[PDB]
Design a binder for this molecule. Structure first.
Ligand SMILES: CCCCCCCC/C=C\CCCCCCCC(=O)OC[C@H](COP(=O)(O)OC[C@H](N)C(=O)O)OC(=O)CCCCCCC/C=C\CCCCCCCC
Ligand SMILES: CCCCCCCC/C=C\CCCCCCCC(=O)OC[C@H](COP(=O)(O)OC[C@H](N)C(=O)O)OC(=O)CCCCCCC/C=C\CCCCCCCC
Ligand SMILES: CCCCCCCC/C=C\CCCCCCCC(=O)OC[C@H](COP(=O)(O)OCC[N+](C)(C)C)OC(=O)CC
Ligand SMILES: CCCCCCCC/C=C\CCCCCCCC(=O)OC[C@H](COP(=O)(O)OCC[N+](C)(C)C)OC(=O)CC
Ligand SMILES: CCCCCCCC/C=C\CCCCCCCC(=O)OC[C@H](COP(=O)(O)OCC[N+](C)(C)C)OC(=O)CC
Ligand SMILES: CCCCCCCC/C=C\CCCCCCCC(=O)OC[C@H](COP(=O)(O)OCC[N+](C)(C)C)OC(=O)CC
Ligand SMILES: CCCCCCCC/C=C\CCCCCCCC(=O)OC[C@H](COP(=O)(O)OCC[N+](C)(C)C)OC(=O)CC
Ligand SMILES: CCCCCCCC/C=C\CCCCCCCC(=O)OC[C@H](COP(=O)(O)OCC[N+](C)(C)C)OC(=O)CC
Ligand SMILES: CCCCCCCC/C=C\CCCCCCCC(=O)OC[C@H](COP(=O)(O)OCC[N+](C)(C)C)OC(=O)CC
Ligand SMILES: CCCCCCCC/C=C\CCCCCCCC(=O)OC[C@H](COP(=O)(O)OCC[N+](C)(C)C)OC(=O)CC
Ligand SMILES: CCCCCCCC/C=C\CCCCCCCC(=O)OC[C@H](COP(=O)(O)OCC[N+](C)(C)C)OC(=O)CC
Ligand SMILES: CCCCCCCC/C=C\CCCCCCCC(=O)OC[C@H](COP(=O)(O)OCC[N+](C)(C)C)OC(=O)CC
Ligand SMILES: CCCCCCCC/C=C\CCCCCCCC(=O)OC[C@H](COP(=O)(O)OCC[N+](C)(C)C)OC(=O)CC
Ligand SMILES: CCCCCCCC/C=C\CCCCCCCC(=O)OC[C@H](COP(=O)(O)OCC[N+](C)(C)C)OC(=O)CC
Ligand SMILES: CCCCCCCC/C=C\CCCCCCCC(=O)OC[C@H](COP(=O)(O)OCC[N+](C)(C)C)OC(=O)CC
Lengths: 187, 187
């Protein structure tokens, strides 16, 4: 820890010198920034004046384009106003002719779908009846085939635990003693 | 592994039974689906003709509004040119004014860019002339701060490593003794 105290003392001495040296450059930069600040203020009205010119020039165009822009708004409006009405009758007509078809389709397929679904429902029943007969038997064999191994798993695993512990206990104690010695060297 | 083999032995016995059983139901499902197809194939024409009946109308409708939409199409083709041509003279005029303004603008920023190069060089030469002496001092001090910063880094680690090897090597052997002692039980 002695080395820490050394650097902690050597640093301050040189640090003060560094601060002083940097402080000189600080003022040097301030002078240069001051000159730059001056230049910014000097050319300020110059750019401002030119801006005011373009501002008015652009605005003058906005005034001239106003009426023309409004006319083109009308000329375009009077176009679709004629087109909309022209394509309205056939548009609504075709819509209805489609809607009625959908209704007819649904109603026409209804009777066919009923008989078909009922026929299938009855057919599926015949399958479930036969399947469920053998399904119960296979399920019974399942549990018998699974409980067999698990019964001989617990006692076996426990027997192994009691066999590893004896030597393990010795290792744990040996580790504890070594662990303490490790910390002593580190700290 | 003995009990594990037991569970595997009765596997095919139980599996083949269910496998063959499901095959029996498969034959039934086969006919169920085969006989059901007789219904599906009959419903096909009912829907096929109905959908085509409407398609015939759609095909006629499209051709009906075909020339009609063309009237509105051509009519909306000349109006586009008219609208654009009307807004052209004003836009083209503003383009000339823009050209004149941009040229004046570039003539104003030109001297500023040239003068800035001189101003930058002057500031560089001044700051550089001063910074040189500063950097030289910092380097000298930094070198001295570096020597006492990592001169005892090696010896400190050497002793830390030396007073550890014996204990470490002893633990390795101890751990190795337990290693094979547990494999016997595990295997
Ligand atoms: C260069 C770009 C422009 C400058 C950028 C840095 C600006 C300053 C900011 C950090 C600098 C590093 C700062 C490191 C921590 C310094 C900590 C320190 O010194 O504390 C003691 C005093 C006072 O500190 P504080 O100002 O933090 O006061 C704390 C106090 N609780 C309070 O608020 O009242 O120090 C002082 O008054 C002035 C000390 C001057 C030391 C020499 C000067 C140190 C300043 C900068 C250099 C630091 C590194 C030096 C070594 C590497 C470069 C050579
Ligand atoms: C238990 C469920 C979870 C574990 C499932 C493990 C399935 C097997 C997977 C790895 C084990 C084998 C890992 C490789 C072992 C070494 C390879 C070996 O055994 O070869 C013998 C034969 C044939 O060869 P392989 O099957 O290995 O295939 C070619 C071989 N690798 C080669 O390159 O030649 O394979 C065998 O006899 C199979 C041996 C294992 C039998 C089953 C051993 C199963 C595990 C334990 C059984 C004994 C303990 C039972 C009681 C406790 C149960 C938890
Ligand atoms: C109400 C105030 C509205 C103020 C204007 C708002 C909208 C401003 C948007 C664009 C302004 C007009 C176009 C400005 C240039 C756009 C980019 C462009 O086309 O450059 C090119 C364009 C055309 O230039 P030229 O015809 O010379 O041919 C290309 C250039 N060279 C290869 C010949 C060198 O420049 C101009 O026409 C002059 C302005
Ligand atoms: C591919 C698209 C190409 C389009 C090219 C440009 C077409 C320009 C045509 C029209 C410009 C937009 C006009 C928007 C206003 C239409 C007003 C109008 O329709 O009056 C006729 C009627 C009722 O209009 P209202 O004024 O009562 O309601 C809408 C307007 N307000 C009230 C919300 C202000 O509406 C219709 O009959 C619908 C067809
Ligand atoms: C292949 C031929 C058919 C092609 C597709 C045609 C689809 C229909 C075309 C045009 C009509 C669109 C609106 C249909 C409304 C009635 C059917 C429907 O969707 O009810 C569901 C929903 C609401 O329908 P409403 O009639 O209550 O509301 C719209 C009409 N009113 C109320 C504003 C007057 O639909 C919509 O909200 C609009 C999509
Ligand atoms: C491996 C093939 C799988 C597909 C084919 C067999 C599909 C049916 C599943 C197993 C077949 C045997 C069924 C045996 C009667 C089951 C009766 C039943 O509804 O139990 C329903 C029950 C629902 O879950 P819970 O946790 O509420 O009940 C657990 C059982 N105790 C506690 C309610 C008794 O789940 C079971 O009971 C376990 C199967
Ligand atoms: C290779 C031949 C043996 C194949 C065995 C697997 C295939 C079995 C075939 C058909 C049956 C499949 C569905 C039933 C599977 C489980 C059958 C069985 O023994 O359940 C046995 C047992 C039932 O438990 P509980 O009914 O009291 O329910 C408890 C609560 N929970 C789980 C329902 C939420 O659960 C176990 O033992 C867990 C392993
Ligand atoms: C290698 C693992 C194989 C797992 C599948 C085959 C073995 C399990 C299937 C059948 C075994 C049948 C004989 C079981 C004998 C032991 C029974 C036993 O001690 O149950 C012990 C305990 C009983 O708990 P409960 O009676 O309160 O049940 C509550 C509902 N649950 C949680 C069971 C869903 O359950 C457990 O500890 C684990 C869930
Ligand atoms: C309500 C749900 C109904 C689901 C039905 C699923 C299919 C089985 C159900 C009914 C069967 C009805 C009679 C079908 C006769 C064959 C129709 C057909 O063009 O098959 C076309 C094609 C081959 O069918 P196949 O295997 O019968 O013929 C094999 C030899 N050839 C014909 C390929 C030279 O399809 C396939 O290859 C994929 C399997
Ligand atoms: C969207 C446009 C305006 C509305 C148009 C009518 C829409 C009607 C909507 C629903 C009505 C039922 C439509 C059913 C379509 C499928 C019918 C069907 O099973 O085809 C089945 C068919 C099977 O394959 P292939 O075509 O090689 O058949 C060869 C043997 N056959 C069928 C000629 C004897 O595959 C197709 O036909 C392609 C679609
Ligand atoms: C808005 C929904 C209206 C529904 C009711 C009416 C449905 C029928 C209306 C139109 C159906 C298609 C008619 C196609 C024949 C006329 C096409 C035609 O105008 O040729 C004349 C002219 C040029 O035709 P192009 O083939 O050169 O097309 C333009 C070039 N590219 C894009 C094709 C590369 O048209 C145009 O310049 C406008 C694009
Ligand atoms: C209120 C009316 C305006 C708004 C509604 C417009 C509705 C029609 C919309 C699009 C189709 C009509 C576009 C305007 C009429 C075009 C007539 C025409 O020249 O057809 C043919 C024309 C051929 O063009 P090119 O490929 O030979 O190119 C020539 C050089 N430029 C023009 C590319 C510089 O097609 C076009 O130029 C592009 C569309
Ligand atoms: C008042 C402005 C806002 C309202 C405007 C409404 C009327 C115009 C409507 C839409 C305007 C869309 C943007 C148009 C931008 C200019 C389009 C145009 O003609 O470019 C035309 C052209 C494009 O570039 P190129 O490479 O093809 O040059 C061709 C000529 N040189 C260069 C080969 C000699 O550039 C010029 O001709 C410069 C004069
Ligand atoms: C707050 C810190 C800001 C730092 C600058 C940020 C970016 C400023 C944005 C744009 C300024 C970019 C300036 C550098 C690129 C343009 C340089 C340039 O003008 O080339 C055009 C011209 C000559 O430049 P050269 O690079 O060919 O010559 C350099 C000197 N030697 C090598 C020829 C001896 O410029 C001048 O003659 C001076 C007015
Ligand atoms: C106390 C509760 C448990 C505490 C944690 C476990 C304590 C130690 C107990 C068991 C862990 C070690 C079990 C295995 C001990 C023997 C390990 C052994 O003989 O390695 C032997 C060998 C070692 O590595 P080699 O580089 O010499 O490889 C030789 C084989 N090949 C690579 C040349 C093909 O590796 C093998 O032979 C195959 C993997």
């Amino acid at each position: 820890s002695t080395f820490s105290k050394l650097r902690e003392q050597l640093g301050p001495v040189t640090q003060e010198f560094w601060d002083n040296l940097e402080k000189e450059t600080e003022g040097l930069r301030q002078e240069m920034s001051k000159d730059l600040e001056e230049v910014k203020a000097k050319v300020q009205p110059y750019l401002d004046d030119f801006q005011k010119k373009w501002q008015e020039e652009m605005e003058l165009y906005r005034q001239k384009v106003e009426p023309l822009r409004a006319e083109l708004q009308e000329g375009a409006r009077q176009k679709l106003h004629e087109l909309q009405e022209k394509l309205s009758p056939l548009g609504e007509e075709m819509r209805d002719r489609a809607r009625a078809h959908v209704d007819a389709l649904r109603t026409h397929l209804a009777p066919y779908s009923d008989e078909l679904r009922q026929r299938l429902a009855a057919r599926l029943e015949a399958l479930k009846e036969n399947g469920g007969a053998r399904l119960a038997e296979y399920h019974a064999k399942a549990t018998e085939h699974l409980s067999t191994l698990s019964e001989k798993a617990k006692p076996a695993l426990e027997d192994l635990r009691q066999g590893l512990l004896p030597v393990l206990e010795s290792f744990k104690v040996s580790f504890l003693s070594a662990l303490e010695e490790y910390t002593k060297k580190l700290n």
